[PDB]
Design a protein around this ligand. Structure first.
Ligand SMILES: CCCCCCCO[C@H]1O[C@H](CO)[C@@H](O)[C@H](O)[C@@H]1O
Ligand code: NA
Ligand code: NA
Ligand code: NA
Length: 158
């Protein structure tokens, strides 16, 4: 089991960490959503699906910088929505193919009522999402840590 981003940055067997750089809607008004869809950015596969079933959860999702201060949100994982920052580990998604498939996570953020101006700065860390992988074969229990970075500023009109 291993993962890679849309630009080919990989995290190999055993876990580790990688940066994910995201383009963000440049203008978001109070009452509107900023959607950060990681299903187009993070992909994983099972290396031995003939014998092993891999189990993948969103173990934890934390907010940083402008997302922590200026937005409220939820995280959608494999069809269900949860609070973001997260309060617990999600149920598991099965990875049973050697063909890469997306990690089905997206953040649904909305500016807080008093947000205004440059609500997210270009180059800043916005979130850390931990993918936890286990299996039905041995004791492997690994973390694939995804550091989500903004490619651009996001302005909330005042
Ligand atoms: C004849 C025994 C072969 C043994 C192969 C194990 C390969 O293990 C890797 O691939 C497995 C399948 O993705 C993962 O469950 C495991 O954590 C690790 O990433
Ligand atoms: Na690998
Ligand atoms: Na692995
Ligand atoms: Na093991």
């Amino acid at each position: 089991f291993a993962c890679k981003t849309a630009n080919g940055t990989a995290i190999p067997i055993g876990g580790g960490s990688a940066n994910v750089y995201v383009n963000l809607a440049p203008v978001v008004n109070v009452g509107q959503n900023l959607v950060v869809d990681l299903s187009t950015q993070i992909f994983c596969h099972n290396d031995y699906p003939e014998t092993i079933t891999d189990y993948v959860t969103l173990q934890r999702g934390s907010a940083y910088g402008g997302v922590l201060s200026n937005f409220s949100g939820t995280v959608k994982y494999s069809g269900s929505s949860y609070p973001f920052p997260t309060t617990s580990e999600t149920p598991r998604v099965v990875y049973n193919s050697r063909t890469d498939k997306p990690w089905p996570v997206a953040l649904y953020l909305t500016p807080v009522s008093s947000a205004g101006g440059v609500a997210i700065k270009a180059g800043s860390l916005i979130a850390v999402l931990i993918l936890r992988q286990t299996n039905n074969y041995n004791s492997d229990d690994f973390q694939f840590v995804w550091n989500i970075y903004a490619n651009n500023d996001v302005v909330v009109p005042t």
